[PDB]
Amino acid sequence: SGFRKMAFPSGKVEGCMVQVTCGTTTLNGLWLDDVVYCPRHVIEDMLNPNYEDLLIRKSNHNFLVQAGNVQLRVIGHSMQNCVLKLKVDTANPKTPKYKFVRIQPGQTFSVLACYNGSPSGVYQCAMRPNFTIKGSFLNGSCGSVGFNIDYDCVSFCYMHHMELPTGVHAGTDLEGNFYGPFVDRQTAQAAGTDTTITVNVLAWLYAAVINGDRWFLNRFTTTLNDFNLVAMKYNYEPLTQDHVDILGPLSAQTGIAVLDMCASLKELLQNGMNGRTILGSALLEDEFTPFDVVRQCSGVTF
Amino acid sequence: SGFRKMAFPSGKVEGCMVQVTCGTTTLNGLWLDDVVYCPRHVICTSEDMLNPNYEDLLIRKSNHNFLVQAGNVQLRVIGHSMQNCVLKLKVDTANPKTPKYKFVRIQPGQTFSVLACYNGSPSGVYQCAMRPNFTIKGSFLNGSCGSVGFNIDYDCVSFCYMHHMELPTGVHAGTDLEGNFYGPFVDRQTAQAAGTDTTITVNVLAWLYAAVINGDRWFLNRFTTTLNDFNLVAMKYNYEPLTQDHVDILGPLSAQTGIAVLDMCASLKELLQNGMNGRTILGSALLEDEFTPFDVVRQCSGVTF
Ligand SMILES: C[C@@]1(C(=O)Nc2cncc3ccccc23)CNS(=O)(=O)c2ccc(Cl)cc21
Ligand SMILES: C[C@@]1(C(=O)Nc2cncc3ccccc23)CNS(=O)(=O)c2ccc(Cl)cc21
Ligand SMILES: [Cl-]
């Protein structure tokens, strides 16, 4: 029993974190085999940077890379989108089995927050529909990474680049493509209006049922179209037939049809919780995917 | 900016997790140097759990009855002893991945990270607090026994908890790494129940200071309170008594934000009376009590917004 916001074990990622320094800027890098990946902004310049022009002026020896108490030697450098790839003379002996994957809004991942190449904490989060993440990052956290683990393989999906004025965060995949309409420069940028991840709220309601919290269940059902009229009114993301199919296993385990759980969610949106909580929360939680619920209620290991 | 329930990076603890098997029971063990620590109930059957005589069950075992697996390698047990509710299995190999560590016994209100494991394999990491009733609200399925709680301030891992049991309300009980249970619990299937739980007042105050540091002040008021009047009100909402030690501990957060501890106590009294009125504090519609004053200082910026 119990249901916690749970992150993947971070050890495989901790063994890849390094410190990258270029002039006066210090941030984090990801060392995989003989390449260190980091935000290209490590190189007033932020007001209107020409990254190729700034990069051409740097030599390999300008980049200082520290792995623990050992200085790595940079022997090459190149830019791929908003990520800088620093070729080093030593392959990381702790390189795990890995892939670079781009995630979609609604998908969750663990973040290993680092400062000066040293991991400080691990937390779970979701890529919001507005492509930001509600992280916890201070100055020096740039280059910290997000990931999932599938079997023994780490799938790196996020690298931290920026904090927006509302205190939310923006970054790229490991190929340097930003999530969202963001750019790596100091200009007027803002998080768009966000919405609630409907399929994740439904998954969390199934998790509450599995754990014995059933007060919100009712005898009613709804059509997918009528539910989506309700979802649009409360700034909830539209629920698709794909989402219904994905929730199939949780529906079979609890005996509650997906559209029957949608009718419970409709009543919670229109009437509130009435002084009650679900899994110790007074808000409808949307940062657990259907897969996260199945994994935490089955004990999958890595 | 931001404020998350953050766990310590788990790598140093992952390298210590092993699987311990005794007959038909399989659970997790913590391998530090040449000793594997695990719950002594690994030697019990389900029938033994009503009234186990651990001394009598243990004397019938030899070293070769304990199977310890570390990854894909079988470790050889060369000795065994019981210390309180923990079994210590001496093995013929010192863990090459043993971090710098200490065994520390914590007090209610303290937080720690839990690395949940099954079959000696880590599955997830989450942040917990030792409740005032000495239980933890964990997430543990069958096979999670032996999973550990820890803090990693600096390069040293301080192990503070080992999982033993799930109570009828779905909350969890365990021991320190010397095998002493937290709370009035026994590693026996007896009528055991979590006592009435209360809210960790000093932690709610720390989290209100975290909200002020991150730029939110809507909940503040023009009032102050005496410590005694605060305690008389807070106990009516099942909040733990606030002591002078708690007031002293909140001193640094009080100096950083410019809000006196008893002035923040007045704000908490008003929040308990009014609720949030559709508002949230650090993205929560409830008063959060699983962040200590030390956690807030560690996570938050040193410059108030
Ligand atoms: C590097 C920087 C940034 O966001 N840093 C931070 C990133 N994360 C958390 C933080 C917390 C507190 C201060 C800074 C933080 C600097 N600010 S900026 O507007 O010039 C900008 C603009 C674009 C990009 Cl891609 C990065 C940045
Ligand atoms: C080992 C056991 C226990 O609590 N197992 C579990 C421990 N943690 C989480 C779980 C979840 C789902 C089922 C079981 C769980 C067995 N039950 S018992 O009442 O006989 C008992 C009594 C005392 C002690 Cl120290 C352990 C146990
Ligand atoms: Cl303590």
Domain of B27: which CATH number?
2.40.10.10
Q: Confirm or reject: Cβ of A163 under 6 Å from ligand 1.
A: yes
Q: Judge whether B164 counts as a catalytic residue.
A: no
Q: Are residues B232 and B163 in the same domain?
A: no
Tokens representing residue A96 in the block: 């795990």
Tokens representing residue B23 in the block: 């007959």
Amino acid at B106: I
Tell the burial category of A286 from Cβ atoms under 10 Å away from its Cβ (0-12, 13-18, 19+).
Answer: buried
Place of tokens 């030792």: B130
Q: Are residues B122 and B95 in the same domain?
A: no
Long-range pairs for A245-248: beta carbons < 8 A, 24 or more residues apart: A246/A199, A246/A290, A247/A199, A247/A202, A247/A203, A247/A206, A247/A290
Q: Are residues A160 and A276 in the same domain?
A: no
Q: Are residues A200 and A111 in the same domain?
A: no
Closest Cα partner for A176 from A84, A86, A83? A83
The three-class DSSP label of residue B147 is coil
Q: Any idea what the CATH number is for the domain that residue A261 is in?
A: 1.10.1840.10
The two beta strands, B100-103 and B111-118, are: unpaired
Report the distance separating Cα B18 and Cα B16, nearest Å.
Answer: 7
Q: How far apart are the two ends of chain B, measured CA to CA in Å?
A: 9
Q: Which ligand has the minimum distance to the alpha carbon of residue A170?
A: 1
Amino acid at B140: F
Phi, psi of A226, rounded to the nearest 5 degrees = -65, -40
Bridge partners (DSSP) listed for residue B68: B20, B75
Phi, psi of A19, rounded to the nearest 5 degrees = -105, 130
* Residue numbers in A near B166 (CB within 8 A): 1
Where a domain ends, among A96, A120, A147? A96
Closest Cα partner for B245 from B65, B109, B59? B109
Bridge partners (DSSP) listed for residue B166: B172
CA distances from B172 to A123, A208, B23, B144 (A): 22, 18, 25, 11
> For an interface test with A, which of B119, B139, B145, B277 has the most A Cβ atoms less than 10 Å from its Cβ?
B139
Q: Are residues B104 and B167 in the same domain?
A: yes
CA distances from B38 to B119, B166, B172 (A): 13, 16, 16
Q: Give Cα B224 to chain centroid, integer Å.
A: 33
* Cβ-defined contact of A7 to B5 (cutoff 8 Å): no
Q: Are residues B152 and B6 in the same domain?
A: yes
Tell the burial category of A202 from Cβ atoms under 10 Å away from its Cβ (0-12, 13-18, 19+).
Answer: buried
Edge-to-edge strand ranges of the sheet holding B25-32? B73-75, B66-70, B17-22, B25-32, B35-39, B86-91, B77-83
Report the distance separating Cα A92 and Cα A33, nearest Å.
Answer: 5
Q: Are residues A54 and A145 in the same domain?
A: no
Task: Give distance in angstroms: CA of B265 to centre of ligand 3.
Answer: 22
Within 8 A by CB and 6+ apart from B87, the residues are: B37, B38, B39, B40, B42, B43, B58, B80, B81
Handedness of CA A64, A68, A73, A74 (dihedral sign): negative
Bridge partners (DSSP) listed for residue B83: B86
Edge-to-edge strand ranges of the sheet holding A83-88? A70-72, A63-67, A17-22, A25-32, A35-39, A83-88, A74-80
Q: Give Cα A249 to chain centroid, integer Å.
A: 24
Residue of B145, B167, B186, B187 with the most ligand 2 atoms within 8 Å of its CB, for mutation: B145
CA distances from B15 to A32, B29, B113, B156 (A): 20, 11, 15, 14
Closest Cα partner for B173 from B153, B159, B189? B189
Of A5, A125, A212, which is closest to B126 when you measure between CB atoms? A5
The two beta strands, A97-100 and A153-163, are: parallel
For A39, the enclosing helix (H) or strand (E) is strand A35-39
For A187, the enclosing helix (H) or strand (E) is none
Place of tokens 């243990």: B58
CA distances from A54 to A38, A143, B243 (A): 16, 19, 57
Count how many pairs of residues, chain A against chain B, have C-beta atoms within 8 Å: 130
Q: What's the domain count of chain A?
A: 3
Marked catalytic residue, from B117, B145, B160, B300: B145
The three state secondary structure string of A163-184 is ECCCCCEEEECCCCCECCCCCC
Q: Are residues B176 and B214 in the same domain?
A: no
Q: Are residues B135 and B250 in the same domain?
A: no
Tokens representing residue A302 in the block: 């890595």
Of A138, A282, A298, which is closest to B286 when you measure between CB atoms? A282
Q: Are residues B227 and B292 in the same domain?
A: yes
Q: Are residues A52 and A139 in the same domain?
A: no
Handedness of CA A127, A131, A132, A134 (dihedral sign): negative
* Residue numbers in A near B5 (CB within 8 A): 5, 123
Are the CB atoms for A206 and A212 separated by under 8 Å? no
For B274, the enclosing helix (H) or strand (E) is helix B261-274
DSSP per residue, A22-34: ETTEEEEEEEETT
Residues in chain B: 305
Q: Are residues B37 and B129 in the same domain?
A: no
* Cβ-defined contact of A11 to B9 (cutoff 8 Å): yes
CA distances from A95 to A8, A31, A234, B226 (A): 17, 8, 45, 57
Within 8 A by CB and 6+ apart from A229, the residues are: none
Where a domain ends, among B156, B178, B197? B197
Q: Judge whether B85 counts as a catalytic residue.
A: no
* Residue A1: closest C-alpha in chain B: B170
Handedness of CA A218, A220, A222, A228 (dihedral sign): negative
Report the distance separating Cα B111 and Cα A72, nearest Å.
Answer: 37
Of A1, A6, A281, which is closest to B125 when you measure between CB atoms? A6
Where a domain ends, among A96, A126, A156? A96
Report the distance separating Cα B7 and Cα B115, nearest Å.
Answer: 9
Tell the burial category of B162 from Cβ atoms under 10 Å away from its Cβ (0-12, 13-18, 19+).
Answer: buried
Within 8 A by CB and 6+ apart from A294, the residues are: A249, A250
CA distances from B228 to B238, B254, B274, B293, B300 (A): 15, 19, 21, 21, 30
B5 lies in which domain range?
1-14+100-197
Long-range pairs for A216-223: beta carbons < 8 A, 24 or more residues apart: A216/A264, A216/A267, A216/A268, A216/A278, A217/A256, A217/A260, A217/A264, A218/A263, A218/A264, A218/A267, A220/A260, A220/A263, A220/A267, A221/A257, A221/A259, A221/A260, A221/A262, A221/A263, A222/A259, A222/A262, A222/A263, A222/A266, A223/A259
* Residue numbers in A near B141 (CB within 8 A): 297-299
